[PDB]
């Protein structure tokens, strides 16, 4: 029982085990899609689920529940549930969850193709959505109705690392009788568990931090058993079919064995970057859940044991110096993924929301400015000396 | 231009070239999350969608490009849209096509996941289902109504393999402004082509014989570039998340590249063995669209190149020889999957279908010695020798 | 045990198995280097060879004894031995065979870096080598000594396809007393059978047909299982290093789970591509087991099951013909290897052997205008369009 | 140029960009084994030397060049060679060296195949060695002979964790006209630099620390360009054919860019394992360079910047506590390897060496009580409470 050890021991043995077969220590790939059965009996055994084992990848796989067992393990959930994408975990829950005429209300700052399948697919199934600003416990609960079935979270947020009191918002949705769902995504379970401060069910695009290594697209979902099996024998079986490969779970489990130490380097260095930056006349604010003067420093303290490995700024000069600046990075790569071990940075303004209108997007916390940076394992040095460098161009 | 050669040409080169970067053969496993820019004018560039490149693996990857520039070629459609399975081709294409008030006339005889769909969860999200025998066209034509967006086959169907006109369900579906979405797995595009007898869309599970190697859960959807583009920036990205895995495209491309010689051998056995088995006095049922009992055999003759590699049969004795039939093949695997290299067989009464009540399963084709047989590359003597021992003690 | 069914269900079956601890069809892909064992006492069993089980994947893996033991059925040999390369199969086993003082007889004809192993790196080591024509046997009978441990052959031989009399050949080395290694790595074990004329030892280059898929590099030896333990816990162990990958054996297990379907084409193929060049008037010699004109046509019809997918031709007008033809194809990919689903062609007087003495080729059987063919999966007629094309530009 | 930047920068980019292709960030696997050519005149050119490109993998391939460039980086060297194992790696090197008539200085503290390879297969091929104590550097002077070409040192060094003076060494070496052969294995380059202190080569087995995940065999050698190209052209194109897959090397490529913090929680790790061990009254001795006792401290000090992430130590009551103690952990496992995530604890008196006459092994510093423990990245305090409650066990 692995669920007795330190977090770290956790983190390496947890839903693990040398194979039974041969003693192979590294889990094997059971890269197969149908699995063979000694006799009828045993197909009927399994398929009315009156017996445990496997049938066909679709529905389980002996890779792919490791990094279930895993997974569940350090967010303290009893279960869970790997999906083709971060996205297919979020869709997977709330599709398993909700049906026409259901209600849910959500943040609104929120990734994006959330709000996408929030705002427009959703009430596309009859499905409706209220989007509040979640940093407010009061306006999730004014927008509660009989409907709502699901309360939707995100912490910290993008773009400006705004937070979200878990804890109380799970008392305000659990009193109006409905589930409290944490995108657990940017903290990783090393530095944030959901489901102690009393969400119900948490998810994670595996493609950031639980990965970490920049070669996977995947998702995962942690709860109770009995929601997870719907998830599973519902959600992903028969609605989204969002299945993860087992080579993805097998790369997942591999990445996630150094989530403690790379967790641990990103936060380091994610600290000295931001006191970097907020010691530079050039750049006007630092979005760090770190920094004294970040709005909700003591909540983040008492959530997170972290700070996290994200930084938003702002520099001097708005949309313009930001674009000097993003092209002037020689060490740092534009994408718009982040939890890679390489310092990763993305200026919105002139890339993903650039067809937006100013004023749309500056609602929407994207001010002309605005960089998002994602701290790699490289030395802080080295990527404040690049940071200075092309800060020192932009302006 | 691959288009232009021949079939086995195609199979074997479209949607693939040698790598530009370094002239390598195979098309390289693009195993990434993220895409790096130049700068960002690229970023903003690619995100509006005003120009071509690569941005993030869930979006679009080279590798699964090719995967799906392939299969557009073979099925001859404009596009292609590769998929984490082929459950989630399937709801990917209707959850992008319906929405809440539509309609959707489907074959009753189609894949059992595909029927919880569109019978539990379809209605959950407002989106009605009627149910018809897809052998008789006028059924389909019954059915329709006002708010029928939609007409869905399979063909061959199981468990009977019996069969359904395309060419002239897809004249139906369109003078009531339908779609016809054609699930062709069964087939491959080299044994029958849908969108060339008026199919809009066609949807694979290409864990079953395009990939042909067993060791991949995947599905494709193949149509129109416009329609494709909405299955991919919504369908995909905001809705099911059903996006596939860099490797497991790379490992359809390897097992697809003998697509033409595997089919022709699975086809080639399978008649074989479907006469062996037409000829055994405790066989009361075999289907087949090869042999010429077949119900449907001259529609059969005009629809596909080849009859398949699925073979239905009905033991004489009911659920007890059926069962002893399968618990006493030794070359024959037991599994649920078919397409594979290997020779699988099931016995539905009393595996899948076990705990439901016989005259439900009656209803649904699901005789109590009906057996399903996917025939594999082996020697067909030794699969019929097999088959034999096992029938003789069977009875 | 599978070594009592036909040829075709030992390609698909033979070495493998449904996995014990889960049913997975697919064999796993145990991507481990380190297994653990349950007691002390196991750990001493199996390292002194008193106990059956892993211990290190340098040493043995569950994934490559599959492919190991597959091969080793085909071949009808004992056991088999998986390599890193079809090099390091040659050199494991004349290094674990010969010491100081050794001599081998070699056919001249033979692949390039084995020609280099032993022209240059063999006698560094104190191990001597006559080079021979390996299709007169006397010349082999002539050049033995009585420190002559190994006659050495390749056939069919590039590059003109000459053929080796292997049962001939054999009689010779063991009344001398020697040992016969074949490379077989031209027929794969579907189109010839050395062990069963006689030879003691063969070798593949799995790199070309047996996995065929252009994507691996590898190599398998196949003998006595006395010899193959000192192969692999001297050879391997100790000598060359050159194990290979348990991902490389499992891609070379799916691969050659079409092995036979996949010869039967390119034979079919090569015989079509053999018979047109035949009648080309712009084409001066076409060399091919299959046509009658070949001068051992008959010894290829007693040693080989099919005539093989290579062919080579000389084009009329020599090097600059050969540079243009190959300059002109646009179907066939300019390459070095071969057996591969996509047709090869190379033109080696103006590409391997550029910078060598024109008559210093000619004595290695390469003239100017020789070309050699890698014929593919491809529909012939297209091969041949292009192949007509290419020449009819090049004169 | 990425030798400009600091360590953790470096192991994280060294020979790796954005795939210049398509963006890419995570280096593709091209996992190919033929490359195609433009012309006739590329394929000439590349292959006489006068082109850089690539031709076929076993020669070389894009994705084990960038492990190759990263390592030459991180070790100080101007070139470097992957291959199958570390073994491979290590005669790959010396048979590229050495020749018949040849001779060899080697410490006798190696790695047992490289043991069994200098006293079994060298003079087998006429190359002569003499082991020595490399620890006394004089005993290294005394062996040495005008026929001399290499000394071969590997430090630390098992079992008992002595070191070697690199720079002492390799003035020796040099002055005799002699190269010095480093095997830095357990230390991998974020721990100690070899060629900073002199040494001509550098060979690691990569299944160790570099890839850290126990789930690649593999090695990789450092040195000057021109001995790499012969070890390229003549040893693994020639010699050993112990070419890495490119699968292989991706995954190093991945496991490596943890390195640094994965090196920097082992040795942090291992010294409070250590030191409670050296405070345990049942443990006799404590092998470990960062405790005081230590035979060579300082030198240690000198010549690593960590004291590695390896422990030997001897428990209380020999032979039979050692095996009470390895049967009774239940967090530490039984196996052979090292550098895994997970802890990995052997006995070798009872296991690898249990068919060993007793005093036979202590020659060989192998005690009765003898263990040797692979400190994972677990929680220390569970390691060492799991050690605590074997050793009070066992005794
Ligand atoms: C990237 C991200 C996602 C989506 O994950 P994918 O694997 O890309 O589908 C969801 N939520 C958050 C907070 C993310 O950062
Ligand atoms: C197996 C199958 C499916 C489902 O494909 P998956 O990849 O298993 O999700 C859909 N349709 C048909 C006809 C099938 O046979
Ligand atoms: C290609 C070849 C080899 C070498 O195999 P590799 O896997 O490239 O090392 C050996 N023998 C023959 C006949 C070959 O064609
Ligand atoms: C394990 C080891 C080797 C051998 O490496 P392989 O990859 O197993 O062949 C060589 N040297 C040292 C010091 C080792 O620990
Ligand atoms: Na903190
Ligand atoms: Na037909
Ligand atoms: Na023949
Ligand atoms: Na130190």
Same mark, same amino acid.
């Given at each position: 029982? #692995?669920?007795?050890?330190?977090?770290?021991?956790?983190?390496?043995?947890? +839903?693990?085990?040398?194979?039974?077969?041969? !003693?192979?220590?590294?889990?094997?790939?059971?890269?197969?899609?149908?699995?063979?059965?000694?006799?009828?009996?045993?197909?009927?055994?399994?398929?009315?689920?009156?017996? $445990? /084992?496997?049938?066909?990848?679709?529905?389980?796989?002996?890779?792919?529940?490791?990094?279930?067992?895993?997974?569940?393990?350090?967010?303290?959930?009893?279960?869970?549930?790997?999906?083709?994408? /971060? =996205?297919?975990?979020?869709?997977?829950?709330? *599709?398993?969850? #909700?049906?026409? +005429?259901?209600?849910?209300?959500?943040?609104?700052?929120?990734?994006?193709?959330?709000?996408?399948?929030?705002?427009?697919?959703? @009430?596309?199934?009859?499905?409706?959505?209220?989007?509040?600003?979640? &940093?407010?416990?009061?306006?999730?609960?004014?927008?509660?109705?009989?409907?709502?079935?699901?309360?939707? %979270?995100?912490? @910290? &947020?993008?773009?400006?690392?705004?937070?979200?009191?878990?804890?109380?918002?799970?008392?305000?949705?659990?009193?109006?009788?409905? *589930?409290?769902?944490?995108?657990?995504?940017?903290?990783? @379970?090393?530095?944030?568990?959901?489901?102690?401060?009393?969400?119900?069910?948490?998810?994670?695009?595996?493609?950031?931090?639980?990965? +970490?290594?920049?070669?996977?697209?995947? !998702? =995962?979902?942690?709860?109770?058993?009995?929601? %997870?099996?719907?998830?599973?024998?519902?959600?992903?079986?028969?609605?989204?079919?969002? #299945?993860?490969? @087992?080579?993805?779970?097998?790369?997942?489990?591999?990445?996630?064995?150094?989530?403690?130490?790379?967790?641990?380097?990103?936060?380091?260095?994610?600290?000295?970057?931001?006191?970097?930056?907020?010691?530079?006349?050039?750049?006007?604010?630092?979005?760090?859940?770190?920094? $004294?003067?970040?709005?909700?420093?003591?909540? +983040?303290?008492?959530?997170?044991?972290?700070?996290?490995?994200?930084?938003?700024?702002?520099?001097?000069?708005?949309?313009?110096?930001?674009?000097?600046?993003?092209?002037?990075?020689?060490? #740092?790569?534009?994408?718009?993924?982040? /939890?890679?071990?390489?310092?990763?940075?993305?200026?919105?303004?002139?890339?993903?929301?650039?067809?937006?209108?100013?004023?749309?997007?500056?609602?929407? /916390?994207?001010?002309?400015?605005?960089?998002?940076? $994602?701290?790699?394992?490289?030395?802080?040095?080295? %990527?404040?000396?690049?940071?200075?460098?092309?800060?020192?161009?932009?302006?």
């Amino acid at each position: 029982d #692995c669920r007795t050890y330190g977090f770290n021991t956790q983190i390496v043995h947890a +839903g693990q085990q040398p194979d039974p077969s041969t !003693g192979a220590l590294s889990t094997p790939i059971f890269q197969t899609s149908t699995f063979v059965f000694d006799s009828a009996e045993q197909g009927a055994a399994r398929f009315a689920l009156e017996e $445990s /084992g496997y049938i066909y990848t679709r529905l389980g796989n002996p890779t792919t529940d490791a990094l279930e067992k895993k997974l569940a393990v350090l967010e303290r959930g009893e279960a869970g549930l790997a999906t083709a994408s /971060g =996205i297919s975990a979020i869709t997977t829950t709330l *599709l398993t969850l #909700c049906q026409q +005429g259901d209600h849910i209300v959500s943040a609104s700052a929120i990734y994006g193709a959330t709000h996408a399948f929030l705002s427009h697919s959703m @009430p596309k199934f009859g499905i409706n959505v209220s989007f509040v600003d979640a &940093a407010k416990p009061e306006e999730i609960r004014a927008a509660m109705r009989p409907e709502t079935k699901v309360v939707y %979270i995100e912490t @910290p &947020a993008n773009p400006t690392l705004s937070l979200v009191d878990i804890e109380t918002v799970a008392g305000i949705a659990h009193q109006q009788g409905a *589930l409290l769902v944490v995108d657990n995504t940017f903290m990783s @379970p090393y530095c944030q568990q959901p489901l102690q401060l009393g969400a119900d069910i948490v998810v994670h695009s595996v493609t950031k931090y639980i990965n +970490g290594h920049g070669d996977v697209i995947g !998702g =995962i979902i942690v709860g109770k058993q009995e929601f %997870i099996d719907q998830a599973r024998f519902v959600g992903l079986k028969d609605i989204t079919g969002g #299945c993860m490969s @087992p080579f993805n779970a097998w790369l997942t489990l591999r990445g996630v064995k150094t989530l403690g130490i790379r967790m641990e380097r990103h936060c380091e260095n994610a600290l000295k970057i931001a006191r970097f930056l907020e010691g530079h006349p050039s750049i006007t604010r630092v979005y760090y859940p770190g920094l $004294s003067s970040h709005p909700q420093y003591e909540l +983040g303290q008492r959530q997170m044991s972290l700070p996290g490995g994200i930084i938003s700024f702002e520099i001097a000069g708005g949309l313009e110096a930001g674009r000097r600046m993003i092209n002037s990075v020689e060490l #740092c790569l534009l994408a718009v993924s982040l /939890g890679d071990t390489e310092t990763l940075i993305q200026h919105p303004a002139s890339m993903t929301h650039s067809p937006v209108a100013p004023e749309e997007r500056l609602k929407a /916390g994207i001010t002309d400015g605005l960089i998002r940076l $994602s701290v790699g394992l490289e030395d802080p040095e080295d %990527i404040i000396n690049d940071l200075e460098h092309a800060i020192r161009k932009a302006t």
